[PDB]
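FAQ: What does a ligand-bound record look like?

Like this one, built around calcium ion:
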Amino acid sequence: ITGTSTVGVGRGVLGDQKNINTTYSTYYYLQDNTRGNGIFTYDAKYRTTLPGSLWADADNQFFASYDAPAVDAHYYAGVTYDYYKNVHNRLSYDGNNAAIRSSVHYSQGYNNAFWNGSQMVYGDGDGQTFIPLSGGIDVVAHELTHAVTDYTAGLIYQNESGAINEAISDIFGTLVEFYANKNPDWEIGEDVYTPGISGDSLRSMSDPAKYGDPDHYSKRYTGTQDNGGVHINSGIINKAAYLISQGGTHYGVSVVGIGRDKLGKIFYRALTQYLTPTSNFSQLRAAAVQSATDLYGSTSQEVASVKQAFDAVGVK
Ligand SMILES: [Ca+2]
Ligand SMILES: [Ca+2]
Ligand SMILES: [Ca+2]
Ligand SMILES: [Ca+2]
Ligand SMILES: [Zn+2]
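The answer part, i.e. the structure of the complex:
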């Protein structure tokens, strides 16, 4: 909507207070004009119609329980935009400041979130498995990273290319979480997963096997469920990414860590310059090696660590 940029205040899912960029025109809308061509957050009103209604608020104060998922989806979309702009010089998910749109309160008791090809979508969870999923900054950046992938490599959401697609979203979801620097970790969704259980998460990059996901190519899933295990086989790539950044020895293969920033540079370059819709795990290794060669040299430690890491997880 056409209006004037304003700044509201509210509370997120976890109860923290944050300022949000809004737009005033009769009502205060969750429309952030300070980033690209706008970040817009919508109310799906417990329905599955999308996008729903642009979030309208009467007083620019968002402290109601019903406001919390919208506050976080709006705010964490902004943080993710900042990450890609400041760190990778990327303007929104299409590189041309495309408007970013999110809907919260999707359906009833919906234990998931997703990017649907046009926008992010967040359920509220059932209160047992999940609380509203936009409360996890790694979840928000995960979904928005799917948009980035859609507009670059376009990895088909099936089998190994789909598992790469998922891993990419976990990697930068985690790197965004580290970028915001609030309780960062190498686990996915811990901030919104099972409020009754401390310390658990949906997935683990440091130890995917913690939740039954493979940490080595020899344990890859190859049935038909989960579009061929895209959320399962991602553990193989997540583990390799984790090893590249943090280092460690895995199935007897020692990896020298090079840190989060260099991981992000290598994998962003791989994503945006070398990966294609049909890339498999082996081609991802080649993409990452060539990327690290472009950035640091063919004889660099960075290249050697990429090779070590994929060796560790059994990808040649
Ligand atoms: Ca209000
Ligand atoms: Ca965390
Ligand atoms: Ca996390
Ligand atoms: Ca939990
Ligand atoms: Zn995903």
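Follow-up question: can I read anything off the structure? Yes, for example: The chain has two domains: 6-154, 155-315.
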